[PDB]
Amino acid sequence: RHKILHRLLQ
Amino acid sequence: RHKILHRLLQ
């Protein structure tokens, strides 16, 4: 679910 | 799905 990408893009 | 554990247990 792109758990990590979201966290990094915030 | 434990993709890695199966591979290691074979």
Added chain:
Amino acid sequence: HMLSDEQMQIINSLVEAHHKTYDDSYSDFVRFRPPVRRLSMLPHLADLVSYSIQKVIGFAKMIPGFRDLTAEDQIALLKSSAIEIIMLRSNQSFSLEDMSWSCGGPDFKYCINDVTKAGHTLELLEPLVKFQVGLKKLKLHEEEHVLLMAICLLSPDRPGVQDHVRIEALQDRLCDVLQAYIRIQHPGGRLLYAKMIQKLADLRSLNEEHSKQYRSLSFQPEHSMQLTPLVLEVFGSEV
């Protein structure tokens, strides 16, 4: 009395399996992401544990009877006892002097403080060290130490187990050997066995607490991205 040729062959297999999956020089530790004294020790600690999982697996596949189980039960047994088996085998490097795991130079000498920098708290590390010390004081023979790990791993009381009747049998066969060996080969071990079965109970508590602290850790993607694919699989709940 005296051990039988069957019980004895079990011991030769387990001790050989251990020797084959546990390096006393800890030479592979240089391949782990370097340690660093927000959870700066996590990368190294995750690699060390991931490495250990692989070793526990190789050891398990050699436990008499384990490989005949269903892939699912094997997975179920590994997933729930993994952390306990790591805690037991790690005792081989624990030192009662500096109260730490010495796997090499000052770098690979893990102190209670270092594990904290991996995202864990005293609520776990305390009973852990206390467990290590108590376990160390039993001066277990190599044959008893390896048997304790094979028994802990074959605990049928694990969430996810199916044939919890065959597993129960395998563990008993092992429990028999351990009790016989202590009686026949270990002078002064009248209370040993009992003290060892007690250690298994301490592991469940440590295991429980670890699962919690690990859960919190896995829900935070900034920390979760530091773990390895195997650690995430073994300690994940996506069964």
Added chain:
Amino acid sequence: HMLSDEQMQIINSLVEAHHKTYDDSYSDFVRFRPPVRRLSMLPHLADLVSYSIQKVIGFAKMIPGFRDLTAEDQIALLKSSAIEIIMLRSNQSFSLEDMSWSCGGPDFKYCINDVTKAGHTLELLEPLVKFQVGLKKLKLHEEEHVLLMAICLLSPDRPGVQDHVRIEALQDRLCDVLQAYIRIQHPGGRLLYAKMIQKLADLRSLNEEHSKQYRSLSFQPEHSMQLTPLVLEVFGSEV
């Protein structure tokens, strides 16, 4: 003519964003799993690429207009251009002499052979090095190099993009600045821009080939377990 105060502010932002996400000393490389000359270089190469993804992200978040896009388009743009942005920024360490990426001592000096030990073949590494060499020969200014990465990343022609109309706009605004800068600030660059837009096309081919070689690599769990959570997410197909 001459650049406007708006085009100029875009350049200051991109160049500062790059400086902030690209260390010329490559001092963090010591924290990666050590390199080793079945795919012995995979662990180190995976860490290096995972590290780079984080940097590409930090750089992207600073591209004017990018952060206003939807989380989904940002994900979509990163996932499909990631490997291309890594190939471009890596050119800063490429050496036309030894035909290799020099990021430090003999250890952090990556040769064509080393990447092979990561699970890749000449069918990719060949066009890659050929791309690096050709790109290096353009002696791009820092301002053009950073603009090329911001344009490659804002390519609206990416699978998964939604508002492929706003993305198209952002890229054009950037394409304008690059063309203006080359005309006003780069003596002898009559054909530059054209040569740069051509490089984008070479990247698509390299990207395509990489996706294939990476796919094969990710289906084998003995190799897949060597990658990092971020690499698996970015190059995974589980969208």
